[PDB]
Design a protein around this ligand. Structure first.
Ligand code: NAI
Ligand code: FMN
Ligand code: SF4
Ligand code: SF4
Ligand code: SF4
Ligand code: SF4
Ligand code: FES
Ligand code: FES
Lengths: 442, 226, 90, 156
């Protein structure tokens, strides 16, 4: 649909985007009601009032899990002797199928800077880091320029707007691992270590970066913050009649007519996104599957296309909303090859810490390669199902491996015939030894 | 604290984890990454038990006993079928890449990986693909290095670095090519590097001085000495 | 060295069953009578024959990951080549 | 054999000012050395360790953990084609075949003249414009196998 009207009331995140796809700098941002929410926060609201305001707005985590942001902010310690607090922006965004944070940071960097300013004032966080992936070169340039402009305009640094609040914002560019987006592994990479995740509890709100209170939030959550504090809680609760408040960047990608990204309210069905916004599938292509929220979510069928894009509805269907950036799979795509590609990514992006991911994802990769070459053997599908069961939530140290086995689960559940078509050889892992008669098991 | 393991009531220390509490009670739970002196990290995922919410709970949930406090009124099962299957699966995943080395390995008959392989009851290989391999380093006159036999339990680095404060041993690489050794060949500089040969549950780090005149642990005549 | 006290051995075959390389083998020969019992202690020069015996093709070192002459790392059966930790590939 | 240049040392120390602990500048120190010299050689591990005050084992562990810190010599330009699932649907395999047939190298290899090294990367966060490539700092989207022999000849 070309006729998209981006009013500031209905499109808080994208109404000040430019038609020539150019970044909005400080003069244009402040012309379009920029840093008004930051001014209201810093000059007329206590940090606890801002935390409760975000909690009452119902801002959920836009990184994929949907944890409540006000609840995460309220879990910082009430001890006044801890004042070395850190606010981290997870600008990693390494999930295959996810490109929303790239748009947000490339074209609206001051929105992210303002959201970090408001959130850092609410959390009493003296320092802030944007943990940005190393491949977003233009995002790094735009974010550093926006931080320099906000520093020269007095919006960052010492004594911001005369309030006495000190906030320093850094941009830390990454060195390319998918596990660096997991928040405790993000904290470990921020400290110059290998990016292994950490066991929770303790959560980073009490013991995070360098043992201090730390809050890790996605780019899009912090970008939702300034509109909440500039327009109010009631406005944020009165733009969607769904249990997930506010707007979300959703989009369809992969062999559709118009792959892209649009800001939509929660409860928008996947079918209307795919048809009205993405334009439907391309010419001579038949829709066969879709992933709702990136490479770590379960595949869904055509019958699930009428589901509203919410956490509860997609969760009730045997998947999860994720990043809400769906990927469409046409009939010309073989599911065994697609899942082999997915598991190859997931197995080589293991951090190596815990046994089931590190040593059973490569086993799934090798089974899928055998099925893709037609050299599958009996027991391979059962081994894949056992791998799916035993890499679920709680069995592995972090959540990388359950997300890895979600597409394998759903592809075996729905498109099992391709997987059974992979099996063509009799089972064997023993060669014959000459003087020894084998134990012929039944 | 009061715990219930397989319906049997035990009195434990509530400040302990379930793995050390259950090993102190004489129960057997397989484990690799945990050590009594190094603490619990939850790496190897071997020590899984099934925790129930109360006595009138039947579903339960697989938890790591080394990362779970043995708090009052705990209900766990070691002999649960799903827990036993998971522990056998963890041994199987470690066995997929493990070299066919037991006869020519100085750890044989004295190897914790052998013991936990047998204890889970895993004796059938259904993995048919290739094993990853590794080059070995020269670690000096005392310690022999065989990185093929590693199970990435992280005991060596946690001991040598977080306990003994040695600087020249670490973990390198990534996903399933994780390497445990020095950054280059040379003598291990810690005065307490020799404890690796007992800290390492496999035959990666072995006593080179013993390896010169090797014999198995059953062939040894021991005495308590100072 | 490798010695066997044949004055003690009961020819039960438990060693050959226990051998993981098929090195030790009980063979169809029974004429082992001796004049002195000390001559029933057979050293390695009395046991090591010049062929494979009853198992003609098994080579344990083709299976072992431990490297010897003629077989470096990655050349055993079902073994991938050693990927160096400094490799450019992810 | 290896000695850190003056500008590298000032950049590393300026990065060390940004953090509570100097260990947190290890990734950026490795990236600074890599930007100056194409890759991180063997002596740079010990040099960065001496500057930062952390063991060389920690520096080597960090350098070998991260995929974009190169511990082997690369070419003058690093081609990084996307390997992930949306570019798989959009046909990255044709792009990889075109790159292989032009450069006569496998992925992970460097051409004999040291001009290009070919690498599969993970998802470049550009999935709606796939398939995607990254030559040294430039992201090229909407790739076709016929546009490779023109894209590669503007990187001398
Ligand atoms: N590129 C991306 O955006 C990617 C996103 N993901 C998302 O990651 C999600 C799973 O990640 P997790 O970190 O395991 O999420 P989670 O559900 O464990 O928690 C998410 C957030 O809530 C906090 N939290 C959760 N329970 C808490 C509690 N009881 N007390 C205090 N804080 C608590 C965590 O600290 C974290 O900040 C998936 O839903 C997936 O969509 C996964 C891969 C890549
Ligand atoms: C393996 C893994 C990778 C993740 N990668 C990212 C990421 O790249 N960006 C992100 O915002 N969250 C990522 N997450 C989710 C974070 O753990 C965390 O939930 C989020 O970054 C911050 O929470 P929020 O949604 O409230 O902002 C990842 C989680 C896992 C398990
Ligand atoms: S599941 Fe385990 S090995 Fe895999 S990325 Fe998480 S902690 Fe690392
Ligand atoms: S480390 Fe243990 S299991 Fe591995 S070869 Fe040696 S004795 Fe066998
Ligand atoms: S070398 Fe030994 S102690 Fe270290 S991770 Fe491997 S098995 Fe564990
Ligand atoms: S085990 Fe071998 S050497 Fe010992 S009594 Fe039996 S056959 Fe003789
Ligand atoms: S002993 Fe508990 S996970 Fe390793
Ligand atoms: S899948 Fe290639 S850019 Fe995301």
């Amino acid at each position: 649909m070309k006729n998209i009207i981006r009013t500031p009331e209905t499109h808080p995140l994208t109404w000040r985007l430019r038609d020539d796809k150019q970044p909005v700098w400080l003069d244009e941002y402040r012309s379009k009601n920029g840093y008004e929410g930051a001014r209201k926060a810093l000059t007329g609201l206590s940090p606890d009032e801002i935390v409760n305001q975000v909690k009452d707005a119902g801002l959920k985590g836009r990184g994929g899990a949907g944890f409540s942001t006000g609840l995460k902010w309220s879990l910082m310690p009430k001890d006044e002797s801890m004042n070395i607090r850190y606010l981290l922006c997870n600008a990693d965004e390494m999930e295959p199928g996810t490109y929303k944070d790239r748009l947000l940071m490339e074209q609206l960097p001051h929105l992210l800077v303002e959201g970090m300013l408001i959130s850092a004032f609410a959390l009493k966080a003296y320092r802030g880091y944007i943990f940005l992936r190393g491949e977003y070169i233009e995002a790094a340039v735009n974010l550093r320029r926006a931080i320099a402009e906000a520093t020269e305009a007095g919006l960052l640094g010492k004594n911001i707007m005369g309030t006495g609040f000190d906030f320093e914002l850094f941009v830390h560019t990454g060195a390319g691992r998918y596990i660096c987006g997991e928040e405790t592994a993000l904290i470990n990479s921020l400290e110059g270590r290998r990016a292994n995740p950490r066991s929770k509890p303790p959560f980073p709100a009490t013991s995070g970066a360098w043992g201090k209170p730390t809050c890790v939030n996605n780019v899009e959550t912090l970008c939702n913050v300034p509109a909440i504090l500039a327009n109010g809680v009631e406005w944020y609760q009165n733009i969607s009649k769904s249990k997930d408040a506010g707007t979300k960047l959703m989009g369809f990608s992969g062999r559709v007519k118009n792959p892209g990204l649009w800001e939509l309210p929660f409860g928008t069905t996947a079918r209307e996104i795919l048809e009205d916004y993405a334009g439907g599938m391309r010419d001579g292509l038949k829709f066969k599957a879709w992933q709702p929220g990136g490479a770590g979510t379960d595949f869904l069928t055509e019958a699930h296309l009428d589901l509203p894009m919410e956490f509860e509805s997609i969760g009730k269907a045997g998947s999860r909303l994720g990043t809400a950036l769906a990927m469409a799979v046409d009939h010309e795509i073989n599911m065994v090859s697609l899942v082999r590609n997915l598991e190859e990514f997931f197995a080589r992006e293991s951090c190596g810490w815990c046994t089931p991911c590190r040593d059973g994802l490569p086993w799934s990769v090798k089974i899928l390669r055998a099925l893709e070459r037609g050299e599958g053997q009996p027991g391979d599908i059962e081994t894949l199902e056992q791998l799916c069961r035993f890499l679920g939530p709680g069995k592995t140290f972090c959540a990388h491996a359950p997300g890895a086995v979600e597409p394998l689960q759903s592809a075996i559940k729905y498109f099992r015939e391709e997987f059974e078509a992979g099996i063509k050889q009799p089972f064997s892992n023993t060669h014959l030894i000459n003087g020894i008669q084998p134990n012929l098991l039944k | 604290a009061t715990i219930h393991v397989d319906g049997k009531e035990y009195e434990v220390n509530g400040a302990d984890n379930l793995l050390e509490a259950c090993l102190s009670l004489g129960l057997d739970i397989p484990y690799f990454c945990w050590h009594p002196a190094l603490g619990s990290v939850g790496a190897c995922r071997q020590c899984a038990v099934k925790q129930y919410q109360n006595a009138e709970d039947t579903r339960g949930r697989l938890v790591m006993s080394c990362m779970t406090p043995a708090s009052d009124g705990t209900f766990i099962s070691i002999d649960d079928e799903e827990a036993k299957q998971f522990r056998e699966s963890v041994v199987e995943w470690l066995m997929t890449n493990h070299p066919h080395d037991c006869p020519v390995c100085e750890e044989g008959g004295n190897c914790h990986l052998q013991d936990m392989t047998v204890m889970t009851g895993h004796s059938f290989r259904r993995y048919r693909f290739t094993k990853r391999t590794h080059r070995n380093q020269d670690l000096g006159p005392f310690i022999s290095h065989e990185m093929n036999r590693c199970i990435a339990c992280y005991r060596c680095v946690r001991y040598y670095k977080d306990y003994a404060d040695g600087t020249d041993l670490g973990v390198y690489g990534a996903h399933d090519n994780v390497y445990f050794g020095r950054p280059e060949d040379g003598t291990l500089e810690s005065e307490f590097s020799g404890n690796l040969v007992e800290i390492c549950p496999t035959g990666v780090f072995t006593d080179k001085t013993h390896s010169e005149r090797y014999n198995r642990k059953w062939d040894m005549q021991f005495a308590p000495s100072i | 060295f490798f010695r066997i006290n044949f004055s003690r051995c009961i020819f039960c075959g438990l060693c050959e069953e226990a051998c993981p390389t098929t090195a030790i083998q009980l063979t169809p020969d029974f004429e082992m009578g001796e004049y002195k019992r000390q001559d029933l202690v057979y050293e390695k020069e009395d046991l090591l024959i010049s062929g494979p015996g009853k198992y003609p093709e098994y080579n344990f070192y083709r299976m072992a990951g431990m490297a010897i002459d003629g077989k470096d790392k990655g050349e055993a059966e079902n073994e991938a080549k050693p990927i160096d930790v400094k490799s450019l590939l992810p | 054999a290896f000695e850190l240049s003056a500008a590298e040392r000032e950049a590393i120390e300026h990065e060390m000012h940004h953090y509570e602990d100097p260990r947190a500048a290890s990734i950026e120190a490795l990236k600074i050395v890599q930007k100056q010299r194409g890759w991180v050689p063997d002596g740079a591990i010990h040099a960065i360790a001496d500057v930062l005050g952390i063991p060389a084992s920690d520096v080597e562990g960090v350098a070998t953990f991260y995929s974009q810190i190169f511990r082997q010599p690369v070419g003058r330009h690093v081609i990084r084609y996307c390997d992930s699932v949306v570019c798989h649907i959009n046909g990255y395999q044709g792009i990889q075949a075109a790159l292989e047939k032009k450069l006569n190298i496998k992925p992970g290899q460097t051409t004999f003249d040291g001009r290009f090294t070919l690498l599969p990367t993970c998802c470049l966060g550009n999935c709606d414009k796939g398939p995607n490539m990254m030559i040294d700092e430039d992201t090229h989207a909407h790739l076709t196998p016929e546009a490779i022999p023109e894209l590669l000849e503007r990187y001398k």
